[PDB]
Amino acid sequence: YDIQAWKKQCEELLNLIFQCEDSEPFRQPVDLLEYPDYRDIIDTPMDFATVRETLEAGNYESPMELCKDVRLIFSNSKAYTPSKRSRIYSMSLRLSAFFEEHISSVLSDYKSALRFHKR
Numbered sequence: 001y002d003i004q005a006w007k008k009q010c011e012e013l014l015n016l017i018f019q020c021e022d023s024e025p026f027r028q029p030v031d032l033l034e035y036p037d038y039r040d041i042i043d044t045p046m047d048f049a050t051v052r053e054t055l056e057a058g059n060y061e062s063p064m065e066l067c068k069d070v071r072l073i074f075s076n077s078k079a080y081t082p083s084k085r086s087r088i089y090s091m092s093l094r095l096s097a098f099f100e101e102h103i104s105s106v107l108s109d110y111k112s113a114l115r116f117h118k119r
């Protein structure tokens with residue numbers, strides 16, 4: 001029932017994601033010199049360094065907010081891919097499966113802890 005435990009759990013999960021070769025295209029903001037029309041397709045860029053920085057700044061109140069930004073990295077990749085068989089999009093699908101697998105208990109434990117606090 002530790003209401004604050006999600007934060008270090010999220011830090012450790014971001015460390016695992018950064019060690020994963022599949023996170024390479026998502027570790028930093030998409031390069032606009034490389035993809036000049038990126039902002040014509042994507043309204044809200046997101047990447048794992050921005051997520052880690054937001055977390056370390058104390059700018060996430062809950063793991064649900066962190067989860068919304070991580071899922072935005074994957075939906076941006078799906079929206080920008082020219083094909084569902086592209087290398088970067090294929091890496092995003094594997095990384096998203098790995099993330100969802102690990103974030104589920106973080107979300108469950110936090111929501112359980114908050115319900116106990118308001119019991």
Ligand SMILES: OCCn1cc(Br)cn1
Nearest residue numbers: 025030077080081086088
């Ligand atoms: O690497 C993030 C930029 N991007 C390229 C494709 Br394909 C989808 N998103």
